[PDB]
Write a protein that binds this ligand. Structure first.
Ligand SMILES: OC[C@@H]1O[C@@H](OC[C@@H]2O[C@@H](OC[C@@H]3O[C@@H](OC[C@@H]4O[C@@H](OC[C@@H]5O[C@@H](OC[C@@H]6O[C@@H](O)[C@H](O)[C@H]6O)[C@H](O)[C@H]5O)[C@H](O)[C@H]4O)[C@H](O)[C@H]3O)[C@H](O)[C@H]2O)[C@H](O)[C@H]1O
Ligand code: CL
Length: 315
């Protein structure tokens, strides 16, 4: 069987790869070769102590983790939320190592980085991604529906927004403020991820509807910017803040919907990491890791056939 993950991220410590997925307390897997994966741990034994306060319907599944390494520590960001609501918060928990067999291994929760509130905020605090600029600063991008995707400066700790705060919109789709603020609306965009490559920051995002089986329209788009704070332009030069986004990979008949990607530079090669819904296996999402190439114009390209050729093993 293939490894099932949603909203995947990855990192490497020493000789081992680690995969983090949406799931109870955040599911972690490990591999020595990115193909064959054993269950490693759940970040939280049960759930964050503060979870049910932000979202009372909470079922134990954290969403859309991001893994970040900084001054020798492991920072695991994660999302508490409810379906179709922006009663949400992103928290972070920190570990000295990922090897659960080490006496140094244990996740310590740092609490809420940011929280969205219905009627107050036109954004949904889920789906964090961490990126550093050329000037020592670290930023979180996040978001889903509502008024789209945001970027803000983190403080020294990486646990809360820097003060005074510094925010930038980075991608959006149409929405009138006259809509009820508690509704997700029709801006089908989520799940930012920023990769630095050469002189550019590349913003990946997911458009369309995930989690809908045969009706899913989820696919990936991309834009690029010389500065981390934007504006991110697609290939036709259109700002993602006004709905720009160049198609990177979309589904077909075997893979109905794919996305919430991450992306990495390991050993002078680049990889695209995402989930895709298998039409043959009940539209159950599967891990896929694709080779991420770059054309002569500075734009990433992927080979959609790799949705088939990449076959991960759950051991
Ligand atoms: O493989 C590993 C396992 O899979 C996971 O199980 C799958 C699912 O993933 C987890 O959640 C995924 C997150 O959900 C996606 O959707 C984001 C949501 O969409 C946006 O809202 C859209 C809006 O919602 C719908 O209407 C909502 C109605 O209003 C509510 O109040 C009412 O309850 C709803 O009926 C409409 O379609 C649309 O208008 C929001 O921004 C957001 O809520 C995100 O992309 C993912 O991050 C979840 O656990 C499973 O459902 C397992 O977790 C893992 O083990
Ligand atoms: Cl993500």
């Amino acid at each position: 069987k293939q490894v099932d993950v949603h909203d995947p991220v990855m990192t490497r410590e020493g000789a081992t790869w680690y995969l983090f997925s949406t799931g109870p307390g955040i599911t972690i897997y490990s591999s020595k070769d990115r193909v064959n994966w054993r269950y490693s741990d759940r970040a939280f034994a049960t759930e964050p102590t503060w979870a049910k306060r932000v979202s009372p319907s909470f079922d134990g599944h954290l969403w859309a983790p991001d893994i970040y390494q900084h001054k020798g520590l492991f920072y695991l960001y994660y999302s508490v939320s409810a379906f179709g609501k922006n009663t949400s918060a992103i928290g972070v928990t920190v570990n000295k190592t990922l090897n659960p067999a080490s006496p140094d291994y244990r996740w310590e929760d740092k609490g809420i980085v940011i929280e969205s509130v219905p009627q107050r905020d036109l954004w949904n605090a889920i789906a964090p991604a961490i990126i550093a600029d050329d000037h020592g600063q670290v930023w979180m991008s996040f978001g889903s529906f509502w008024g789209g995707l945001k970027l803000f400066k983190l403080n020294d700790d990486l646990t809360r927004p820097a003060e005074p705060q510094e925010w930038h919109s980075i991608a959006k789709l149409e929405r009138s403020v006259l809509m009820d603020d508690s509704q997700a609306g029709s801006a089908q965009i989520e799940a930012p991820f920023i990769l630095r490559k050469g002189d550019y920051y590349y913003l990946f995002a997911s458009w369309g509807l995930c989690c809908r089986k045969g009706d899913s329209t989820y696919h990936l788009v991309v834009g690029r910017s010389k500065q981390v704070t934007g504006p991110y332009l697609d290939k036709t030069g259109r700002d993602m803040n006004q709905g720009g986004g160049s198609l990177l990979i979309k589904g077909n008949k075997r893979w109905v919907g794919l996305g919430h990607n991450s992306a990495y530079t390991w050993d002078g090669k680049d990889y695209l990491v995402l989930h895709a819904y298998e039409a043959a296996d009940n539209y159950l999402q599967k891990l896929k890791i694709l080779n991420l190439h770059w054309d002569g114009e500075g734009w990433p390209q992927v080979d959609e056939k790799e949705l088939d050729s990449y076959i991960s093993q759950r051991l």
